Symmetry: D2
Subunit: 358 residues, 4 copies
Amino acid sequence: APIKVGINGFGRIGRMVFQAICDQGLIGTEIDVVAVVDMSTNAEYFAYQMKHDTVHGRPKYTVEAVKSSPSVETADVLVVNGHRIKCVKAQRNPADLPWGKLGVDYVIESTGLFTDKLKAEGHIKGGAKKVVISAPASGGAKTIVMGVNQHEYSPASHHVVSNASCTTNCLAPIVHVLTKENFGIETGLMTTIHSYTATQKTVDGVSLKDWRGGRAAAVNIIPSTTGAAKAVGMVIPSTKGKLTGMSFRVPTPDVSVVDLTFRATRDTSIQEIDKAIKKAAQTYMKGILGFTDEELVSADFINDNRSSVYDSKATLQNNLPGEKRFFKVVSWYDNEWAYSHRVVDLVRYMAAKDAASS
Amino acid sequence: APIKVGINGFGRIGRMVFQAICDQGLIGTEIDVVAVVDMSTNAEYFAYQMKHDTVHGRPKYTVEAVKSSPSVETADVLVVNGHRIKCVKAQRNPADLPWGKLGVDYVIESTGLFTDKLKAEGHIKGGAKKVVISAPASGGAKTIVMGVNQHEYSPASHHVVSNASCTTNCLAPIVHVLTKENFGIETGLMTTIHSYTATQKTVDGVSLKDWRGGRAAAVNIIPSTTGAAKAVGMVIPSTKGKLTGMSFRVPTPDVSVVDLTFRATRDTSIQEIDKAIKKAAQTYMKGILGFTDEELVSADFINDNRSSVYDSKATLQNNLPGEKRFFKVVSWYDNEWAYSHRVVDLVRYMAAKDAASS
Amino acid sequence: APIKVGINGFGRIGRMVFQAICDQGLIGTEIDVVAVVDMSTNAEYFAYQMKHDTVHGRPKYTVEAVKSSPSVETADVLVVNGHRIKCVKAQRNPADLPWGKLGVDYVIESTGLFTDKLKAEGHIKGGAKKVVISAPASGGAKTIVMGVNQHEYSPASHHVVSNASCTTNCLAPIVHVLTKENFGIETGLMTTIHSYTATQKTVDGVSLKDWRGGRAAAVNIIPSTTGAAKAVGMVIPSTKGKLTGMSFRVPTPDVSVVDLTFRATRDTSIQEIDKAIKKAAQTYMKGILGFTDEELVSADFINDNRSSVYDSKATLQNNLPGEKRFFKVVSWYDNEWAYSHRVVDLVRYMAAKDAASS
Amino acid sequence: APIKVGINGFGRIGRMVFQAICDQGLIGTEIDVVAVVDMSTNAEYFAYQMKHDTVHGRPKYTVEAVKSSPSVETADVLVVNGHRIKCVKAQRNPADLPWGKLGVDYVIESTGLFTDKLKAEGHIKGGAKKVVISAPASGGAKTIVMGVNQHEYSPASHHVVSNASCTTNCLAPIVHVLTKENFGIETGLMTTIHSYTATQKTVDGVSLKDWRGGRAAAVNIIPSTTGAAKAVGMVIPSTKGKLTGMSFRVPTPDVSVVDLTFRATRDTSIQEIDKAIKKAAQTYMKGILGFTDEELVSADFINDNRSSVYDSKATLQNNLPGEKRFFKVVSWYDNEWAYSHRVVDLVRYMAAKDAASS
Ligand SMILES: NC(=O)c1ccc[n+]([C@@H]2O[C@H](COP(=O)([O-])OP(=O)(O)OC[C@H]3O[C@@H](n4cnc5c(NCc6ccccc6)ncnc54)[C@H](O)[C@@H]3O)[C@@H](O)[C@H]2O)c1
Ligand SMILES: NC(=O)c1ccc[n+]([C@@H]2O[C@H](COP(=O)([O-])OP(=O)(O)OC[C@H]3O[C@@H](n4cnc5c(NCc6ccccc6)ncnc54)[C@H](O)[C@@H]3O)[C@@H](O)[C@H]2O)c1
Ligand SMILES: NC(=O)c1ccc[n+]([C@@H]2O[C@H](COP(=O)([O-])OP(=O)(O)OC[C@H]3O[C@@H](n4cnc5c(NCc6ccccc6)ncnc54)[C@H](O)[C@@H]3O)[C@@H](O)[C@H]2O)c1
Ligand SMILES: NC(=O)c1ccc[n+]([C@@H]2O[C@H](COP(=O)([O-])OP(=O)(O)OC[C@H]3O[C@@H](n4cnc5c(NCc6ccccc6)ncnc54)[C@H](O)[C@@H]3O)[C@@H](O)[C@H]2O)c1
């Protein structure tokens, strides 16, 4: 049973979803990537985009750009590891995409334009059974963070699911062991020192909705907002209105770090917390939550696919010496990598439960 | 008599041309900026963008944003030192712009989208008399570099003119005094090590016309094409087919350097060349061509309004010891600031020549 | 009566303390900078460093390099605006510095090698009557943040004064009015997102005492320690053990931002806190604390000489909506420029007190 | 029969040479690394430097840090792949290093300090049989570029050998096929847009020998000099006094590119030169000279061990269309990694020739 997926928007996350599908062994055997969609249908230019990444390197798979038939002027079929993917043209409305016809059942929505559960339904109107939004979703969609609440999915009810944001996926696992191990956050504020993204600008330009976010990106520390402010309360309803935060966008191109400052419900210590987070990383959060005892800096997390990886030393040293309630917890994440692995983990969970019931 | 100008595209070059008008003492008196055009009309947002620049800092003029009538919702008039500039909404076609209505005669075309003579003429159809494309132009518009061939301008024939590009305004000064002081160039190639611009990308992205241009801009050395390649031959026909080159877009926000390598027509020396450039700096090319004897790096050329500023020490330490024909000439330039100043000098030179005749 | 000073270690803070002295209009008239001490004595090189700065531009003063005698090989005296500063060679011990000879009474200890009280007394034995260390000090030196506790300085008891770090001169204003306006801080942790410094490395290199800190500076988010972790308790005895923090060094050359997360003593609001700080900013903290109501990023604080300028918007927008105990204060600072001005303002304060008593 | 080698200066090149020895299969069987030398004897700090590199990522090999006796305070032995390397304490004179005692015959000198052939013999007085200087040398040390002139090595008389610089290793292959294939280079001039290195400064600071080299590294285009200005004439004497160049140090942490403008000795075409370089890349320069047909940028050459990998499209698109003599040739290089592999290649060659005769 090849899960038939199509990628709408072959950008940073689209191309890293694609690469997490090939690197993890699933192309053409477990998941069938039927088609990819973006502005051009020049498969040679997509191959160029895949083969050479500034931040994550050359990939291990191989890519060819072949035509479907010599009647077409430019290569339109991509051939990865002998698997053929089709380069479909970008549609302004989700519904004008031929999903049903190409036989695509699960569509990964990663353009960034269709974050509303209502516009994303246009995929299903085009023929898709399910939709995963690689972002926070507005308008009613289900937001799941793997390792914390993927089980609340239901094939029957949830058809446009959302995998939250990179920072949610990092914060929430931290929050989830704090509650489940019962330290509890009474209240919590959080900062994500975060790499710049494709929504920012090389030099000072136009950004109407966030004035600061239009400042030259690679030469300014830019205050702005994070997506995990809302979404962690959505995933864990016990933190609704207990926790919020901001974002500082600094001049690195990938990897970010969460910096959570909370107050505990019961009296505890940072040694108890560090123990429970390591334990959790080895037992029930394994693969999603990780930890590190080394003096790592940010470029040591490029290509690290844990959702979140707790920094044991930066935490243990930077807390109040005899504290029972006021705690800092530092944790890292490759915003482009681990998040792209979680999208594929979610597709496959959903396909499993969709077959499990119908 | 105030020159009635309208800036279409209030971006890096739009806003710097505006600020140059204020810093030189022309607003309201010598130059009247009737209107600016961009993706919004919210003048409180153009205020912010004028008041805070990452590279060139805070401006000396004062900016206020007020509403034209109490009927409008968001402030839509700019007021720069008690002079009113209007914030007109952007049009997909130049012909649709109310230029004759607003009373604009000269339009500075700096959107980047209308570098063709004919899409630029839509301005004259919208009620403008003359257009200055802040870029090189296709379709046959007049290309004039100030200090070299601005005298070639005719009020009768040149309605869409072009002030070439930043690199062309840096290299043609140098090429000009080499041809005029009789050293000559037999053939020559050129390289601009240049700052990234707003067409480049924060993270690897789509750029289907120059594939490399699409790669993360601030973490890479990206080879690409320079404007001064085509344009130095248009300005000096003597260099047609004898001079071409490339760009290496490197991770800095502003200022670029030209690295010219040429073979001279007669047997000379680099000290003869160094003295002639210094001479031409102090005599005929003043304010256009400049020079330095100091050990400077790119950050020192921020806000240097010279088109070309020769580096006497880098040229001299990095040429062959007793050479008569093969030489290197190095020259800096603030690609944003100086080019903007030269646009204003062109507007003013055209507007005076037009009055002197009609 | 010129306050006889000499700067030991003319680097970033040494040249910004020097430009602060000249710019405020003090050189020659109120402060006589007798000598500057560094790894060289080539006043031509020192003058290359003064005239061109990558982050703070061309200075307002003029620097000339003169020979004290034609008997010396290279220029060894700096003439800044007609005034003569001598270039004395760098000693490995403060003690062997000719202070008593040169006439120097106040020494600004900005090498960053003699931060302990006792190696700092090495200048006094050698002739200086007073010493200001541009860094937190060990061995029991008096730590003073201007505008918070300079009233505690006593000419009799305190000869080796510490002006604390740049982050404590940003964090200590805000903790001072939070206690003075009785909100009070129960416990609190802080993070500074901070620009890389002279003590960091261009490529991965050696740093034996903090491992992460030797990593490539300009391409990593390097977690580390801050100086305000100790210093804010030395200055504000109330905060002894209630507040600590950490630093994240990010890829910008200058300007940083504190991000304090505290739990107040009483029940309050962020609009209450917002008013209290702004008020304080206009009244008793005017010149130390500042605020902004604008959407500014880090490069808008280059050359802002307030110790701490509070960002009203980023705070109000990124706090929990109806919270009474758990808050986040965000505040900027130009760690090179603001600090250096406090240095010149401590010399000036201490000096007059000494002249008041003896 | 292992070659016994010691590395002095375990910095960027020392650690990359170490990693090229383990990568190429050579550690413990073909090359035995007896000792590594740097500021510390802390095996743990060395292991942290090896395992986490910002640019080249995690090494494939495994590093442990053990104590050589229960008596030593801190781990002083590395155990890379079961092979034990000693951590010898850094010395001020090469001669005071225990090479004969340890049993070291070949010494990779890579501190950046002992670049004089006389200072380098200190190693042979310390007990070593040969010295390789990972940098151009003075005082008459024989200079070799692998792939161009290592056949000029005489076991007999060449004792302290210099592997030239990274730019001579990129430049000399290109210059070598142009003279061997009989295009010739009459006079030539080059420029290398180049990543910053460890001799540079994060923020503006001290640099007495090159004034510009002290300016903040990651925020300027810094003109400077190159090592291949001297060394290529020494490897290829045909080109002494005929070829020279300069350097621009830009804000990338690794990879650099050679922009070479030369005039041929005979009428030829850029198409012809393009074929010759591809041909060479495939036959006698294989593994040393490569080429690319792709639209690559600097980051695509990280971990590319060819010494010089020619850009076919950048060279072909940026030359004069009718030219027969005056050309531009562009070739890339990962300045840390390819040079490191070549140092191992020379040590290996040298050692086999020395065995062959004695
Ligand atoms: N990078 C990270 O760290 C990260 C982490 C977690 C989550 N995410 C999230 O994933 C999403 C994508 O982010 P990213 O970083 O990959 O950004 P990106 O800009 O690299 O990727 C977006 C991609 O979508 C493409 N695209 C634009 N309009 C499209 C369209 N119809 C419209 C159309 C049709 C015709 C014409 C015009 C428009 N149809 C299909 N593709 C279109 C773009 O060309 C681009 O390749 C965002 O929501 C972001 O929040 C990013
Ligand atoms: N920066 C430098 O160093 C430099 C130096 C020399 C020369 N230049 C040249 O000047 C030009 C501008 O470069 P820049 O660096 O200022 O770039 P920039 O991107 O900062 O400026 C371009 C500006 O034009 C605006 N714009 C886009 N479409 C527009 C439109 N109709 C279209 C429309 C209408 C409605 C919807 C959609 C589209 N009408 C009016 N404004 C529009 C953008 O919002 C932006 O503010 C380029 O040709 C560049 O080569 C730059
Ligand atoms: N930049 C900021 O944001 C900032 C803000 C606040 C506070 N600070 C603090 O101020 C201090 C300086 O920082 P910075 O950023 O200016 O750094 P910097 O490296 O730019 O300045 C240090 C200066 O001291 C010089 N120096 C070294 N050894 C010296 C010596 N004897 C020794 C000697 C003699 C002979 C040989 C060898 C050694 N005698 C005199 N000068 C010597 C260096 O050449 C350099 O110019 C630090 O403690 C730092 O924490 C910096
Ligand atoms: N990175 C590149 O792209 C590249 C490419 C090609 C070639 N290279 C060349 O290789 C050389 C090294 O460059 P790099 O980039 O690796 O620089 P780097 O700074 O990373 O490496 C230099 C290493 O030498 C160490 N060192 C300093 N003094 C030493 C000493 N005695 C002295 C001592 C003893 C006690 C106290 C004080 C001093 N003995 C042993 N080690 C010492 C440093 O701690 C450092 O680890 C340079 O000549 C450079 O031109 C670099």
